[PDB]
Design a protein around this ligand. Structure first.
Ligand SMILES: Nc1ncnc2c1ncn2[C@@H]1O[C@H](COP(=O)(O)OP(=O)(O)OP(=O)(O)O)[C@@H](O)[C@H]1O
Ligand SMILES: Nc1ncnc2c1ncn2[C@@H]1O[C@H](COP(=O)(O)OP(=O)(O)O)[C@@H](O)[C@H]1O
Ligand SMILES: [Mg+2]
Ligand SMILES: [Mg+2]
Lengths: 523, 542
């Protein structure tokens, strides 16, 4: 049955037509009496052969592009993943219980896209761009693809601009450049979103003070999160005023796994509107470890082979092609930026997991959130020894760079001499200076939630702590002394530090002087 | 025009099947796709059996239809090679991605060839001085060797491979090729801009005086492009070795990415998965690539390859296969990095073929074996030092722990590429100063100094320079009370006077979002295409 033997059946070899002409006068009368039992034939439309596990196998669709939005007659969208010779397998962006075998599949003619623009600012959308906030459709908007390739080497520049988080431990010790990716990695319940929420609230305070080109438009993507937490977050952004600059992409835990897999690409495409028009974006992928679990579900249901942790093997490319789109563009492309904050949930502090080590080898730094520093009340529980930001360093606030070089230094010795004194029986009194300055600086760096601090009021509080001016206070009233420093010091010294950028020696003298007339609560 | 022009049969991610009605292309031949938005070439991987070839796309397949015309080029992927490719950045298929014009090609070489034969091999071992203490002592590199840096996501393989570009690749008088296989794009641009400011890459009419050519297949590329861009980097390095006949420095960042990209593809080629979900052909795919990166009798390639280990697991199928392919393996550890020791080289897991008494001399060899004997016997003690503490040790064993903590800190050093984020300037340490320095700590000449005098210093002259600074500051901690530059009149204007010198910034209040934006009309209904390809709203049934 070789192929040379079957193409001989192309040319006719009967020389006898006594039932070629017999059924040709009886076929059309036979077909005509079974017409209400024929579904109409399908060539450029599609018909569902088989649906189940959130994957539909579609007969027909002769001209679908690979990776194209297809629309079922139930109104549900899909994406043509694999075009095969006999069918096209689509993945259903929604609930597969409303798709039946025999349903018509329509072609939209466009590769999978979301509405991007200025009119998507302020809105709560799903993983496909359809708004779920109930306040209408998206107007003043246009469609852009969710799988855009990242800009190349020549379309980029180095990060220069300092993108203040408003978190004291972050902007002092691991500062964030404006086109940078920074992993927020930690255990469950360690203030992962707290660091990313305080970054978003802080841009609302800064956007109303910068001249329209240094404004940061945030995007928050929730993958696998409960709807109530997402709804409690849109209420917090609406009441802080941060919703004016924020897009909220939401694919909750009840949503389909292709809607949670696609939601960071949908949100990255909306944040790429500001990168590609010279503005500045900030995107948070909250639980990118939940987006890999949703993609692991689609790969196992597509019967792709398991991997190291049963992940598809292309789960690195899932996150690498996502986070490479967070870039600082060059001057001929507008100079826009996109800053990513992926969030990875860690099980029992184990950072040697598969998805954790993947995103570490993609992103530019990490913000490690220790679950033992979080239980002791040190919040944000920044693991200072492990948290890295080298791309954002030498791009930070110049005045903070003077006062935090000794802050990282006096914390580097503090971890050395707390490792040497695991118990109190030996007292050197030259390391007790480090135990009294290290416990001073730890209390300075911890701050409470949903109140981000400007960078000029954050430089002075570390100026008042790495130097003297707080050795009077024992360890307890330092949080009260910091608000005693910030309120009692003349607010005209915060304008000089902000406008000059750094601590001039004219201001170094004045701020040593104003820090001596502060009524410290520890007396 | 019809035959030798096939059509796209089926698309499964990066894998495209093309059916040719006659004259199938050979395996490894490249196939252009007509009518794609970008240039999509496909490398033929398999003959499927029914006039169908199975191909690997070197770009994205989003936009492929199952009738698309596919033209065979009759040859593999052929990239520009020669002295005109220097100072340029290429992708997997040889296109310039640096916007500097077309590449002045001396020749057009296909990226697929066999290894040099057994008669072509060169057996010569001379040392490569890197200026790194732990490298030049314990696992010294070979000047025509294969060098592997083994790392676990953040332990410092890229900083180490960037320091070897700083130390070795300037004193080395040949050409360099940097193959970036599946790494960060920012690093590529950072390395591209730090070579232009160093004069390693010269732009404009001075392009011929460049010493490095870059081939970049970074981690935004599809898995077909990252599985073949290492072969594009060898082909540029093999032209300088075979035809030009000179010594090449080949730096491959994340060599494991080539193995990982073939593992993303092997699932879709219909292959039963191997151990850990890897492709069954893991040892021969990596083998057929690594056996090309050698020194022949006509030229030399000194290859440094960063190898990423997946879950800090050195027994994983892709790090474990690479170990047999290297003359020197520098294993970087995570626990060494958490003690603050940089470069985070495991001294008892790093190994060099170069560390032989005949090859490096008996004085160098006995210091390295004595350093490893102290660090191993200290590792045998750490189970008791954790539980019982150092109080229960014999004082013969306390001298072991005291010397091993000293040589552990002394193996670390500051890098000239790491001073941009550490602040400490970098120290190139000559080979004679590492052998002299570590021999003194082994015999006992420096038991006087503390542990932290050895931390982040160049040579043993600087341990004594730092033991004084540490000693000197145990006296001086104060006396900054009065007689300042910070009093009232001397250099200081009024504070309200400084507020008037602030230039006021006009905030434009309107956010500038609708400047040039065109807004397409989103319909109230889902717009779809009917059987005739016409834009029709979605019909009303379900
Ligand atoms: N700096 C802080 N001070 C006090 N409470 C905080 C601080 N940061 C976060 N919290 C609180 O601690 C709890 C956990 O923080 P958060 O929810 O941000 O962590 P997470 O990493 O997102 O956890 P999950 O895995 O539950 O999403 C919350 O109740 C939060 O309000
Ligand atoms: N030699 C070094 N000196 C100082 N810090 C280093 C060194 N190597 C790595 N690091 C720190 O660890 C991080 C990892 O370095 P890098 O080589 O980029 O990572 P990887 O080895 O995962 O590719 C750096 O960003 C830096 O913070
Ligand atoms: Mg959370
Ligand atoms: Mg790296």
């Amino acid at each position: 049955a070789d192929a040379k033997a079957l193409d001989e059946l192309r040319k006719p070899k009967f020389s006898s037509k006594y039932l070629i002409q017999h059924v040709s006068q009886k076929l059309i009368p036979a077909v005509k009496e079974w017409e209400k039992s024929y579904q109409p034939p399908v060539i450029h439309l599609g018909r569902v052969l088989s649906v189940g596990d959130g994957i539909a196998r579609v007969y027909g669709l002769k001209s679908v592009q690979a990776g194209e939005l297809v629309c079922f007659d139930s109104g549900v969208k899909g994406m043509a993943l694999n075009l095969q010779a006999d069918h096209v397998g689509v993945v259903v962006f929604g609930n597969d219980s409303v798709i039946h075998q025999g349903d018509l599949v329509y072609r939209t003619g466009q590769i999978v896209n979301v509405p991007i623009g200025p009119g998507t600012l302020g809105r709560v959308t799903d993983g496909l761009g359809q708004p779920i906030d109930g306040k209408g459709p998206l107007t003043n908007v246009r469609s852009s693809l969710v799988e855009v390739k990242a800009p190349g080497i020549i379309a980029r520049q180095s990060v220069r601009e300092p993108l203040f988080t408003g978190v004291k431990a972050v902007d002092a010790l691991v500062p964030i450049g404006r086109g940078q990716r920074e992993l927020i990695i930690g255990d469950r319940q360690t203030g992962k979103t707290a660091v990313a929420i305080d970054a978003i609230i802080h841009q609302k305070n800064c956007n109303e003070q910068v001249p329209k080109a240094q404004r940061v438009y945030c995007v928050y993507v929730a993958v696998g999160q409960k709807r109530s937490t997402v709804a409690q977050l849109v209420k917090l952004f609406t009441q802080t005023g941060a919703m004016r600059y924020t897009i909220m992409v939401s694919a909750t835990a009840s949503d389909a796994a292709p809607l949670q897999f696609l939601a960071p690409y949908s949100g990255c495409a909306m944040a790429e509107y500001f990168r590609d028009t010279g503005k500045h974006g900030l995107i948070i992928y909250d639980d990118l470890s939940k987006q890999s679990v949703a993609y692991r579900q689609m790969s196992l249901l597509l019967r792709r082979p398991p991997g190291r942790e049963a992940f598809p093997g292309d789960v690195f490319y899932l996150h690498s092609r996502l986070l490479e789109r967070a870039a600082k563009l060059s001057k001929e492309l507008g100079g826009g930026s996109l800053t990513a904050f992926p969030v990875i949930e860690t099980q029992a502090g184990d950072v040697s997991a598969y998805i954790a080590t993947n995103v570490i080898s993609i992103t530019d730094g990490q913000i490690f959130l220790e679950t033992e520093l979080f239980y002791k009340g040190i919040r944000p529980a920044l693991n200072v020894g492990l948290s890295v930001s080298r791309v954002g360093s030498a791009a930070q606030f110049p005045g903070m760079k003077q006062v935090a070089g000794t802050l990282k230094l006096e914390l580097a010795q503090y971890r050395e001499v707390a490792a040497f004194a695991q118990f109190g029986s030996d007292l050197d009194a030259a390391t007790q200076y480090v135990l009294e300055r290290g416990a001073r600086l730890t209390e300075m760096l911890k701050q409470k939630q949903f109140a981000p601090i400007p960078i000029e009021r954050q430089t002075v509080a570390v100026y008042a702590a790495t130097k003297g001016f707080l050795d009077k206070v024992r360890v307890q009233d330092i949080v009260a002394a910091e608000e005693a420093v910030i309120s009692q010091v003349n607010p005209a010294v915060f304008k000089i530090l902000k406008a000059n950028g750094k601590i001039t020696p004219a201001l170094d003298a004045h701020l040593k002087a104003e820090l001596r007339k502060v009524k410290l609560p520890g007396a | 025009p019809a035959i030798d022009a096939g059509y796209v049969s089926q698309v499964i991610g990066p894998v495209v099947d093309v059916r040719f009605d006659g004259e199938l292309p050979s395996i490894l031949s490249s196939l252009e796709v007509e009518g794609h938005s970008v240039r999509l070439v496909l490398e033929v991987a398999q003959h499927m059996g029914d006039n169908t070839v199975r191909c690997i796309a070197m770009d994205s397949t989003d936009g492929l239809v199952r009738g698309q015309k596919v033209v065979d080029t009759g040859s593999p992927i052929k990239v520009p090679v020669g002295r005109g490719t220097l100072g340029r950045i290429m992708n997997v298929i040889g296109e310039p991605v640096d916007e500097q014009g077309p590449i002045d090609a001396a020749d057009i070489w296909s990226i697929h060839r066999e290894a040099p034969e057994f008669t072509e091999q060169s057996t010569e071992q001379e040392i490569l001085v890197t200026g790194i203490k732990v490298v030049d002592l314990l696992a010294p590199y070979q000047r025509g060797g294969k060098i592997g840096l083994f790392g676990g996501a953040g332990v410092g393989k890229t900083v180490l491979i960037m320091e070897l570009i700083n130390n070795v690749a300037k004193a080395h008088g040949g050409f360099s090729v940097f193959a970036g296989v599946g790494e960060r794009t920012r690093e590529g641009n950072d390395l591209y801009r730090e070579m232009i400011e160093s004069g390693v890459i010269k732009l404009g009419a001075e392009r011929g005086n460049s010493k490095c050519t870059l081939v970049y297949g970074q981690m935004n590329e599809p898995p077909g492009a990252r599985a073949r861009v290492a072969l594009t980097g060898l082909t540029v390095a093999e032209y300088f070795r075979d035809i030009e006949g000179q010594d090449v420095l080949l730096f491959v960042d994340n060599i494991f990415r080539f193995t990982q990209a073939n593992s993303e593809v092997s699932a879709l080629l219909g292959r039963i998965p191997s151990a850990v979900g890897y492709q069954p052909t893991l040892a021969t795919d990596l083998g057929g690539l690594q056996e090309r990166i050698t020194t022949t009798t006509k030229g030399s390639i000194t290859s440094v390859q960063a190898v990423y280990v997946p879950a800090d697991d050195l027994t994983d199928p892709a790090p474990a296969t690479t170990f047999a392919h290297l003359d020197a393996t520098t294993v970087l550890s995570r626990s060494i990095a958490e003690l603050g020791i940089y470069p985070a080289v495991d001294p008892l897991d790093s190994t060099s073929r170069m560390l032989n008494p005949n090859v490096i001399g008996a004085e160098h060899y006995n210091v390295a074996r004595g350093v490893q004997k102290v660090l191993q016997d200290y590792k045998n003690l750490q189970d008791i030092i954790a539980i019982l503490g150092m109080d229960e040790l014999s004082e013969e064993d306390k001298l072991t722990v005291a010397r091993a903590r000293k040589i552990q800190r002394f193996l670390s050093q500051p890098f000239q590429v790491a001073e941009v984020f550490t602040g400490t300037p970098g120290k190139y340490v000559d080979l004679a100063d590492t052998i002299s320095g570590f021999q003194g700590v082994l015999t006992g000449k420096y038991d006087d100094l503390p542990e932290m005098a050895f931390y982040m210093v160049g040579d043993i002259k600087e341990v004594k320079e730092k033991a004084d600074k540490m000693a000197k500051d145990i006296a001086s901690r104060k006396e900054a009370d009065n007689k300042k530059v910070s009093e009232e009149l001397k250099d200081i204007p009024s504070l309200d006077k400084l507020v008037s010198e602030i230039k006021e910034v006009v905030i434009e209040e309107d956010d500038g979002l609708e400047e040039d934006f065109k807004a397409e009309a989103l319909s109230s209904e889902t717009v779809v295409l009917n059987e005739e390809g016409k834009s029709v709203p979605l019909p009303k049934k379900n």
